[PDB]
Amino acid sequence: ESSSSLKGSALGKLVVTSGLLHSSWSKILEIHNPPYSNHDPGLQVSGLEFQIHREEKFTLVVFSAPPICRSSSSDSTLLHVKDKENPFPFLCSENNPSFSLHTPAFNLFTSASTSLTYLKSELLQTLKSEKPVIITGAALGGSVASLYTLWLLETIEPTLKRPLCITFGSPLIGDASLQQILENSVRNSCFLHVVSAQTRIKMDFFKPFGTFLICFDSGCVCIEDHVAVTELLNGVHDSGLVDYSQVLNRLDQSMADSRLIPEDVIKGIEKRAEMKNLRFDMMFKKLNDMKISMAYIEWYKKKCKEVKIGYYDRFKTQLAFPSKEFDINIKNHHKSELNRFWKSVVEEVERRPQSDASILKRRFLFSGNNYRRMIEPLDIAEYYLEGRKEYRTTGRSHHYVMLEKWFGMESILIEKERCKKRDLSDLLTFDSCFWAEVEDSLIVINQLNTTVGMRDDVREVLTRKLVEFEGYVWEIITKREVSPEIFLEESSFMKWWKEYKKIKGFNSSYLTEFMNTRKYESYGKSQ
Amino acid sequence: MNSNSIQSFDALPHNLRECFLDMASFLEDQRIIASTIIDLWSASYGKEGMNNLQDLASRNLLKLLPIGRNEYEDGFYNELLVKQDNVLREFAINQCLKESSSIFERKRLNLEIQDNKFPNWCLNPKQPIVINASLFSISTDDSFASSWFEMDCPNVEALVLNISSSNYALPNFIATMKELKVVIIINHGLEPAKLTNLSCLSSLPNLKRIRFEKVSISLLDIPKLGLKSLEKLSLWFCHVVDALEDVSETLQSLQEIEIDYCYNLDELPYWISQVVSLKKLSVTNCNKLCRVIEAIGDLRDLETLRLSSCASLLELPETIDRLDNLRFLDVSGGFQLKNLPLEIGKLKKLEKISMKDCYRCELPDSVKNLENLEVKCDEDTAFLWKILKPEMKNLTITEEKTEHNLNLLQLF
Amino acid sequence: AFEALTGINGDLITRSWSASKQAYLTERYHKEEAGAVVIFAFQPSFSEKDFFDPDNKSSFGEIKLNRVQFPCMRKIGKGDVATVNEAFLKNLEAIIDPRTSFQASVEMAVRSRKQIVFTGHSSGGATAILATVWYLEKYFIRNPNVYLEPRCVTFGAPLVGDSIFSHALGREKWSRFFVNFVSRFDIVPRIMLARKASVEETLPHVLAQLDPRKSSVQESEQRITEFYTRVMRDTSTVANQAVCELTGSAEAFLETLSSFLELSPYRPAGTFVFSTEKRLVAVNNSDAILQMLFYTSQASDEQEWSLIPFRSIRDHHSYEELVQSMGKKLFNHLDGENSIESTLNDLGVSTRGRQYVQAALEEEKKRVENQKKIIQVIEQERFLKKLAWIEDEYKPKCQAHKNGYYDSFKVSNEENDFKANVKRAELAGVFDEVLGLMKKCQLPDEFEGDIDWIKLATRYRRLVEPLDIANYHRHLKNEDTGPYMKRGRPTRYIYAQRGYEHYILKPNGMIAEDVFWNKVNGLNLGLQLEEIQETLKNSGSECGSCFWAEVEELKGKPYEEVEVRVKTLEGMLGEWITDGEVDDKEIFLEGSTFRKWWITLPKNHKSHSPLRDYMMD
C-alpha cells in the first residue's frame, strides 16, 4: 500500500512492457550468436567487442567483454579532477574531487576510446536530432557500456535528450564517491541495471548507482533508492551466472506475487522518498524568508549610503571592528541564512533541473541573480579581511559562479532595454566581483609604494595592471554598469582613487577628468 | 514646549516622576536597552520597574521599541529599546538641576567632563568633598584621561558611568559608595573601552547589579573581585581579554548572568559553571561560541538556560541532562543547532522549550518523556513536534510568527 | 439511493437503452418524446474511420477542442484546452449542422422546459457525451435551471476526452450529468486506450464482429484474440504510468522511460457504472475508473484467457440484460464505502489492482485535505490582516502623502513602505503555495471555480499586483529581465485574473480575449486590426491590475511612438474604475507617476482625452 512499493512494481511493469529489455538482450545475444555467418574458408579468421545497430527510431550500442575473474579481480583506479588520465573531469565536484572505477572495466573503456570517440559525436548528434540512444552490455560488457554512457553525459542541459544505459548482471563500477556524485541526479537516471533477485554482490568498496530492475520469477521491481539496493543485493560475493534469457522469459509470463520485497526495505524507501519531497517543498517556501532577509539588507544598504560609507565598507569595517548590533544581525542572521540557502539551491538544481526547459526557474534564477549581485560583495569583504588574494580567479564560492553563468545564459534570450536617463541609485552592479578588483588594485598600489628592491620588470606589470583597472573602471562607468554608491566618501573605491592619484601619470585619463571635475556626483541621477 | 510635557509631568504619581527624573542620567538620543533601566530601578522599585517603564511609555514620556520576541514575561529585557525625546530629557535634566541649588545637596547629580576640564566643585580646596546624591551619573568624552578627584559619596544607590574612552579607570571614590546597589557602565565610543580599577567595587556591601556595555574586560577575572552581594551580572557587546588571586566564597549571591553580543567569546569561563546559586544563565548573539562547557551540569539550581542566536553553536552540552531544576530552555535563533541533548527527557521540571528558528535541530527520542511541555517555535520547526504530539502527554505547540519592523536599525 | 447518486431512475435508463437501439435504424440521430422527457439517441458506427480519423496524423486520433465554442473545456489558470476524439467530434458537428433538425428540436425542448437526455450505445454514446457538453456550453452555462439540466446516459461507450476534459467537467460541476454503463468485459470502453498502430491490423474485423447488423462472414479467433491482447497491453501501460504519476512524486526514471513510451491521452469522463451478474458498482473517480478498466478485464486461468477476448466482444451487447436486471443486482457506490475489497473482488480485481484503485481514491481524499488546509490559512486573521493593513492603513496614509501607495512603495522612504514590502512577500508565498498545488493538480477540480477563492484572489490581485509592479520597477528589474508583462509577471496573478474572467464571462459565452479585442476596435484607433493586435502585444491593457506596468512602459517615450497604447489604456481606464480594478483615489494624485506622465502629454491629446477632468494641466 506504500506509494513507493506501488510505484516500484508499476514501474517494473512499465519497463517490461517497454520492450527495452527484449531489444537490448536480443542484440547482446547476437554478439556471440551471430545471425548471419558465412562459411567461406577465406572470410574466417580477448579485448572489447562492440556492435552498433542503427535502427529506425533509435540507435543501440552493444559492448561485450571477456568473462570476469571472480575470486580477486576487485581493482580500483582513482581518477582525480586534476589528473589528465581522467576521462570524466566533469563528474568531479568540490565535495568530490576524485572517484574510483573498477579497473578492468575502466581500462576496457580507455583502450577503446579510440574509434569510439567518433561514435560519441554521432550519438550526440543523434540525440541532438531527438533520436533515442540505448547503450547496453552484459556483465563486464555492461560495466563498459555504463562507462561509455557516463562519457556521453558530459553536458547535461534539461533540453538535450539523454542516452539510456541498460545492464544485465553487471558487476559494480563505482565507489562511494561516484555514488555521491550521481545521487538524485539526472545522470543517475540514465542507468537501468537489470539484476536477478538471487544475485549477490560484495559491496565493501564498490557501490551501486543508477536504477535497478530486480527480477523475480513473479515479476520485477524497479528500485531507485541506493541504500535499498545495497540492502537487497549486498552479500559476500555470492555471484552465480544468471542466464538472463531465462529471467526475461519469466518476467514475460506475468500470470506479480505478494511480498517480492521485504517490508522494512520498502519502508525505508518510502521514508527517504518522503523526506526528499518535504525538502523540495521546504526550499520553495523558505525562498520567501530569503526574500525577506534581502529586504532587511535593502534597508541596511540605504542607511549605509546615507552615512556615506557604503554597505560593503560598513560590512567590512564592522566585521573587523564590531561596534553596532544591527550589522552583527545582518551578517550572522540574514547573510548567513542566505548563503546556506543559495548554496543548497545550486547544489540541488545542478543535480535535478527545475523544469523541462530550465535548470533554474524564474523565481529562483532571477532572485538568485539579485542575491548574487547584492551579497557576493559582502563575501568579498570577508575574503579580503582574511588576507586572501585574487578573488575572481581563485576565491569565488562555486554557487555564485553557477548563478552568474545561468543568469547569463538566459539573459542572452531576454528582450530588455536600459533607459539611459533612469536613476541608478538602486542599481546592483552587474560584475559582482567589482569590489575584488578594487581590493586587488589597492594591493598593487601598496606593493608599488612599499616594496623596495623590486625589479623593474615586475614594476611594469604592476603599473599596467594599474592602468588596466583604470580602464575597467572607466568602461563600467561609461556603460552605466556600477552602482553610484562606489562614489561615497568612505568607500574603498574613493580610497583607491585617492591613493592612485598620487601614483598615476601623464596620460589621457577620462577617468581623472571625470573625478577631478566632480561629475561622478551626477553619475546615475537624472531630473 | 508641549501642553502634555509640563502637564503630564505635573500630574505624575510620585514614583513615575522620580523615574522620569532618573531618565536624565542618559545621553542625548541614547539607545537604551531596557535591561539598563530595569536594573537601575530595581533597587528603589523592585519588580515594578517594567510596570513603571510601560506607564511612562503610555503617557508619552518615553518610547518603547521591541527588537525581537520581547517576551518580557520571562524576565528578559534585552529585546526592548527605550528612547526618550531630547526635549523631555532636557526638561528632566533641569528638574534635577532645580531640586537643589547646591550641587552638594542634589539628589540626582549629573556630572559632565569634556576635554578633561573638571567643573569647579570637583577641584575645591576644603576637602573633604561630600556629595548627597542618590543617583549619580558621570559622562566623559574620548579624550578623558581618568585623572580623578577625591570625594565621598555616602548616599549613592545607583551609578551610571557614560564613557567614550579607549581606556577608563573607574574613580576611587566609588569605594566610598557603601550604599550602591546598581552600577551601569556604557561605552559610547568606537573602540571597546578597556576598564581598570574594577577593584573599587570589591567591598561595596550592597552591590547587587552590574551591567557593562561595549567595554573590554577579563570575564575570567570577575570572581577575583569578590562581589559577595552581587545578584545579576550583565555584559553587552563587550570584548573579552583572557587575563591577582582567587577569593574565598566568590559570587556567593550571584543569581543571574546575562551575556549578549560578546563577539570574541569562544568559551564559557569555567567559573560560571561553578556558581551553585545561579538561577538564570543567558548567552545570546555570541557568534564565535562553538561549544558550551559540560561543567554547566554542575549548576544545580539553574532554572533558565538561554543559549540563543549563537550563530556558531552547533550542539548543546549533553550534561544539560543534570539540570534537575531546569524550567525553561531557550535556544531560539539557533539556525545551525543540530541536536537537543540526548537525555533531555530525564528532566522532570522542564516546562517550556523555546526554539523559534532551529529548523535544522533534530529531536531526541527522550522528548516523548517530557510531559505538560510547551514548545515555542516557528511552523517549520513545529513540523517534528506535530509528529511527536500524539505520543506525548499534554504537549502544547505554540507557533510564533515574526513581527517585522525596522527597530534594530536604531542600533546602527 | 441510486437516483441520489446519479440523477436517473431506471425508467429513464430503460427508455434510453430503447432509444439507443432505435438509433441504429436512424441516420445519425433519433428523437423520442416520452411525456416531458425528450431523448436524443445517436447512431453508432462500426467503421474504423469513426474511431481513428483518416486525416488525423496522431497516434490516438485526438484533436484539441476549439477554445471559442467550448470555452469551459480547459484548465482556467493554465489555459490549456481539453482534447477529444476527432472522429466523434466530427460526427457531432455533422449532427449539429443546421441542415439537420437537431438544434431546432433541442431549442424547442428547452423552451418547453422538458428534460433533455442524450444517449447512445457504443460510439453513439461517445457522440452523446460530446452532444451533452455542446448543450452545456450553449444553453446550460447561460442561465442554468434545474429544468434545464441535461442527462447523458451511455452504454458501452468508448472513451472520449483526456484528463483536462474530465477536469473541466469536474470544475463546472457538470460531471454529475454523465452516467456511463459498462459491462465488465466490454472492449469498447478500452479500445481508445490503445495506440492506433497496435490495433489497426485487427480493428476493422473486430468492429465488424461488434456490429450486430453484420455478416460475421469470417469469425476469426486470432484476430479477436490479437486485438484483445494489444488493447489490454497498451491499457496496462497507461495504467502503470498513472500509478507512477498519481502523487506528484519525483519521477526521474519515469521521465527517462518517457522517450520509449507512447500512451493514450483518453480518460474516463463522468460517472461510470460497472455491471457484473451480481453488482452494479458506481464510480466517480476517473483515475480509479481507469485502473478498473484494466483490472476488471483479467483472467485467472489459461482457459479463461482463451475465452476472454470473445466475452470481451459479446459483452458489448450485454446491455439489454443489464437494463432488465437492475432490481436483481447489488448496488453500491465505490467512492463512498469504507471497504472496497469485496466490491472489487466481485469484479475480478487482483489485490494489487485494489491497491492501485485505492491509491487513486485516496489521492482524491488528499486533494480535498489540501483544500481544507488552504482554506484554513486564508481564513486566519493574520493572513486577512495583511490585506487589511495594506487596504485600511497603508493606502489611506500614502494617499495623504499625495502620491499614492504605488509611488510611495516605489520611493521606499518610510518603515511603512518596508512593512508593505514584507506583507507583499509573505502574501506572495501563500499564493505561490496555492499555485504550486493547482499546477500539479493536487486540489479538487472544483477549486478554480470556487467563488470564495475567486473573490479572495481577486481582492489580493487588485490590491497587491500594483505593489509587485512597483517592486519590479523601483529596483530596475525591468532593466534586467525585461518588461513585466512578459517575464516578470507572477503566474499567481494570471491564474487569479483568468479565474475571475471565467467566472464573470461564462454566463454569456464570451472569452476575455474576444471581449478585449472588441473593446479595442470600438476605440476607433483606426489602425488595421492585425497591426493594432501587434502593437498591443504583451500590453497589460488586458488587466487592470497590470495598469502600472503599462504606464511604466509608456512613460517618457515620444508620444507618437505609443499613441495606440496610450489611447487603449485611457479607453479601458473607465471600466477599470467602475469594476474596482483600479482605484480612482490613487492614480490621479499629483504625486502619482501616472498623473505626472500624463500632464507631459501633448495638449491636443489631453483636450480630447476621457481623463482630462480628472487631472489639471
Taking contacts as CB-CB distances below 8 angstroms, the residues of chain A near B289 are: none
Nearest Cα residue to B216 out of B198, B200, B197, B238: B238
Residue B90, C-alpha cell as written in the block: 532636557
Query: What is the DSSP code (8-state) at residue A15?
Result: H
Pick A277's closest partner by Cβ from C236, C250, C436: C250
Nearest Cα residue to C264 out of C287, C239, C244, C296: C239
Cβ atoms A298, B377 nearer than 8 A: no
- Note whether A407 and A431 are same-domain residues: no
Residue A69 maps to which CATH number?
3.40.50
Architecture field, domain B100-244: Alpha-Beta Horseshoe (3.80)
Residue A308, C-alpha cell as written in the block: 556615506
Nearest Cα residue to B358 out of B377, B330, B334, B388: B334
Residue that terminates a domain, selected from A381, A416, A451: A416
- Note whether A96 and A164 are same-domain residues: yes
- How far apart CA C283 and CA C276 sit, in angstroms, is 14
- How far apart CA A306 and CA C312 sit, in angstroms, is 82
Query: What is the DSSP code (8-state) at residue C579?
Result: H
Backbone angles phi, psi at A478, to 5 degrees: -45, -50
Query: What is the DSSP code (8-state) at residue B140?
Result: E
Backbone angles phi, psi at C56, to 5 degrees: -80, 120
- Number of other residues whose CB lies within 10 A of the CB of residue B322: 19
CA-to-CA separations, C94 to C3, C46, C53, C100, C110, in angstroms, rounded: 33, 17, 14, 8, 21
Please report, to the nearest 10 degrees, the dihedral formed by the alpha carbons of residues A269, A274, A276, A280 taken in order.
160
Cβ atoms B134, B107 nearer than 8 A: yes
Q: Is A329 on the interface with B (CB under 8 A)?
A: yes
Nearest Cα residue to B288 out of A316, A328, A311: A328
Question: Is the peptide bond prior to A97 cis by the omega test (within 30 degrees of 0)?
Answer: no
- How far apart CA C365 and CA B315 sit, in angstroms, is 41
- How far apart CA A486 and CA A488 sit, in angstroms, is 6
Nearest Cα residue to B234 out of B142, B311, B138, B306: B306
Strand partners, B397: B375
The residue whose grid cell reads 507618437 is C560
Q: Are strands B280-284 and B352-354 parallel, antiparallel or unpaired?
A: unpaired
Residue that terminates a domain, selected from A231, A261, A291: A261
Residues 6+ apart with CB under 8 A from C66: C81
Q: Is A227 on the interface with B (CB under 8 A)?
A: no
Report angle CA C507, C512, C518 to the nearest 5 degrees: 105
- How far apart CA C160 and CA C132 sit, in angstroms, is 12
The residue whose grid cell reads 571597546 is B192
Please give the method by which this entry was determined.
X-ray
Identity of residue A416: K
Identity of residue C351: T
CA-to-CA separations, B289 to A313, A387, A465, B321, in angstroms, rounded: 26, 23, 42, 20
Identity of residue A447: Q
Q: Give the number of domains in chain A.
A: 3
Residues 6+ apart with CB under 8 A from A353: A158, A186, A359, A360
3-state secondary structure of A207: strand
- How far apart CA A478 and CA A461 sit, in angstroms, is 25
Sign of CA dihedral C132, C136, C138, C143: positive
CA-to-CA separations, C454 to C74, C451, C499, C501, in angstroms, rounded: 17, 5, 6, 10
Instruction: Name the residue range of residue A99's domain.
Output: 3-261
Backbone angles phi, psi at B115, to 5 degrees: 45, 40
Residue that terminates a domain, selected from A357, A381, A416: A416
- How far apart CA C183 and CA C319 sit, in angstroms, is 8
Domain boundaries, chain B: 6-88, 100-244, 265-400
Nearest Cα residue to C221 out of C318, C331, C310, C90: C310
How many residues does this entry show for chain A? Answer: 527
Say what angle helices B86-98 and B14-22 make with each other, to 10 degrees.
110
Residue A243, C-alpha cell as written in the block: 542466464
**Is residue A62 a part of any domain in this protein?**
yes
Residues 6+ apart with CB under 8 A from A271: none
Cβ atoms A27, A53 nearer than 8 A: yes
Nearest Cα residue to C246 out of C434, C446, C447, C441: C441
Residue A262, C-alpha cell as written in the block: 521485504
Report angle CA C450, C452, C455 to the nearest 5 degrees: 105
Nearest Cα residue to B382 out of B355, B409, B352, B411: B355
Report angle CA C178, C180, C182 to the nearest 5 degrees: 170
Please name the residue ranges forming H helices in C506-562.
512-522, 529-535, 547-554
Final resolution, Å: 2.5
- Note whether A318 and A354 are same-domain residues: yes
Please name the residue ranges forming H helices in A386-527.
391-394, 398-411, 434-450, 456-478, 492-503, 510-516
**Is residue A273 a part of any domain in this protein?**
no
Residue A427, C-alpha cell as written in the block: 542599481
CA-to-CA separations, A179 to A84, A174, B41, C236, in angstroms, rounded: 22, 7, 64, 33
Residue B177, C-alpha cell as written in the block: 559608595
Sign of CA dihedral A505, A507, A513, A514: negative
Say what angle helices A434-450 and A362-385 make with each other, to 10 degrees.
20
- The string of DSSP letters for B20-69 reads HHHGGGS-TT--EEHHHHHHHHHHHHGGGHHHHHHHHHHTTSSEEEE-S-
End-to-end CA distance of chain A: 68
Q: A328 and B261 in contact by Cβ < 8 A?
A: yes
Whether C186 sits among the annotated catalytic residues: the reply is yes
Whether C316 sits among the annotated catalytic residues: the reply is yes
- Note whether A225 and A366 are same-domain residues: no
- How far apart CA C238 and CA C261 sit, in angstroms, is 9
3-state secondary structure of C584: coil
Q: Given this chain, do its domains B100-244 and B265-400 carry the same CATH topology?
A: yes
Cβ atoms A40, C386 nearer than 8 A: no
Q: How many alpha carbons fall within 13 Å on the CB side of residue C610?
A: 12
Cβ atoms B128, B104 nearer than 8 A: no
Residue B49, C-alpha cell as written in the block: 520597574
Identity of residue A358: S
- How far apart CA B219 and CA B239 sit, in angstroms, is 9
- The string of DSSP letters for C299-321 reads -SSHHHHHHHHHHHHHGGG-HHH
Cβ atoms B213, B190 nearer than 8 A: no
Q: Which residues of C222-237 are buried (b: 16+ CB within 10 A; e: fewer)?
A: ebbbbbbbbbbebbbb
- Note whether A106 and A190 are same-domain residues: yes
- Number of other residues whose CB lies within 10 A of the CB of residue B340: 23
- How far apart CA B272 and CA B295 sit, in angstroms, is 9
Identity of residue A241: L
Taking contacts as CB-CB distances below 8 angstroms, the residues of chain B near A327 are: 412
Q: Which helix (H) or strand (E) holds B39?
A: helix B34-45
Q: B237 and A332 in contact by Cβ < 8 A?
A: no
Residue A480, C-alpha cell as written in the block: 552605466
**Is residue A495 a part of any domain in this protein?**
yes
- How far apart CA C544 and CA A93 sit, in angstroms, is 49
3-state secondary structure of A62: strand
Q: Are strands C83-85 and C62-64 parallel, antiparallel or unpaired?
A: antiparallel
- Number of other residues whose CB lies within 10 A of the CB of residue B71: 16
Report angle CA C558, C563, C568 to the nearest 5 degrees: 140
Residues 6+ apart with CB under 8 A from A224: A211, A212, C252, C253
- How far apart CA B302 and CA B331 sit, in angstroms, is 15
The residue whose grid cell reads 474604475 is C577
Cβ atoms A497, A513 nearer than 8 A: no
- Note whether A26 and A159 are same-domain residues: yes
User: Within the 138-177 window of chain A, which residues sit less than 8 Å (CB to CB) from chain C?
Assistant: 161-162, 164
- Note whether A42 and A124 are same-domain residues: yes
Residue B329, C-alpha cell as written in the block: 530552555
Cβ atoms C181, C153 nearer than 8 A: yes
Q: Is A75 on the interface with C (CB under 8 A)?
A: no
The residue whose grid cell reads 537624472 is A526
B265-400 domain in CATH 3.80.10.10?
yes
3-state secondary structure of C4: helix
- Note whether A226 and A163 are same-domain residues: yes
Residue A475, C-alpha cell as written in the block: 568602461
Residue C306, C-alpha cell as written in the block: 482463451
- Number of other residues whose CB lies within 10 A of the CB of residue A25: 20
Q: Which CATH number fits domain B6-88: 3.60.10.10, 1.10.1040.10, 2.40.50.140, 1.10.10.10?
A: 1.10.10.10
- How far apart CA A471 and CA A219 sit, in angstroms, is 70
- Number of other residues whose CB lies within 10 A of the CB of residue C137: 20
CA-to-CA separations, C397 to B278, C357, C578, in angstroms, rounded: 50, 57, 23
Sign of CA dihedral C482, C486, C490, C496: positive
**Is residue A275 a part of any domain in this protein?**
no
For chain C, the maximum distance between any two Cα atoms, rounded to a whole number of angstroms, is 92
- Note whether A349 and A432 are same-domain residues: no
Phi-psi region of C557 (alpha: psi -120 to 50; beta: other; left: phi over 0): beta
- How far apart CA C149 and CA C140 sit, in angstroms, is 7
CA-to-CA separations, C280 to C326, C334, C344, C460, in angstroms, rounded: 8, 10, 11, 47
Q: Is A424 on the interface with C (CB under 8 A)?
A: yes
Tell which of B65, B69, B404, B412 to mutate to test the A interface (max A CBs under 10 Å): B412
**Is residue A277 a part of any domain in this protein?**
no
- How far apart CA B68 and CA C61 sit, in angstroms, is 64
Q: After which residues do gaps appear in chain B, with C to N over 2.5 Å?
A: 243
Strand partners, B235: B212, B259
Residue of chain C minimizing CA distance to B404 = C419
C34: buried, middle or exposed (CB in 10 Å: 19+, 13-18, 0-12)? middle
Q: Is C229 on the interface with A (CB under 8 A)?
A: no
Q: Is C491 on the interface with A (CB under 8 A)?
A: no
Beta-sheet strands, E only, within B285-387: 304-308, 328-330, 352-354, 374-377
For chain B, the maximum distance between any two Cα atoms, rounded to a whole number of angstroms, is 78
Cβ atoms C28, C169 nearer than 8 A: no
B192: buried, middle or exposed (CB in 10 Å: 19+, 13-18, 0-12)? buried
- Number of other residues whose CB lies within 10 A of the CB of residue C310: 16
Q: Assign 3-class secondary structure to C436-504.
A: HHHHCCCCCCCHHHCHHHHHHHHHHHHHHHHHHHHHHHHCCCHHHHCCHHHHHCCHHHHHHHHHHHHHH
Nearest-neighbour CA in chain B from C245: distance (Å): 26
Nearest Cα residue to B147 out of B177, B175, B116, B122: B116
Chains with ≥3 Cβ pairs under 8 A against A?
B, C
Q: Assign 3-class secondary structure to A84-103.
A: CCCCCHHHCCCCCCEEEEEH
Identity of residue A515: M
Q: Are strands B232-236 and B239-240 parallel, antiparallel or unpaired?
A: unpaired
Q: Is B190 on the interface with A (CB under 8 A)?
A: yes
3-state secondary structure of A191: strand
Strand order in the sheet with A49-54: A49-54, A59-64, A133-138, A164-168, A191-196, A211-215, A220-223
Backbone angles phi, psi at A511, to 5 degrees: -60, -55
Taking contacts as CB-CB distances below 8 angstroms, the residues of chain C near A190 are: 256
Residue C260, C-alpha cell as written in the block: 520509449
- How far apart CA B81 and CA B407 sit, in angstroms, is 8
Q: Assign 3-class secondary structure to C141-163.
A: CCCCCHHHCEEEEEECCCCCEEH
The residue whose grid cell reads 468508448 is C158
Nearest Cα residue to B408 out of B81, B35, B63, B67: B67
CA-to-CA separations, A443 to A314, A451, A469, A495, in angstroms, rounded: 19, 11, 12, 12
Strand partners, A211: A192
- Note whether A114 and A208 are same-domain residues: yes
**Is residue A278 a part of any domain in this protein?**
no
Cβ atoms C497, C461 nearer than 8 A: yes
- Among the listed residues C50, C53, C162, C186, the single catalytic one is C186
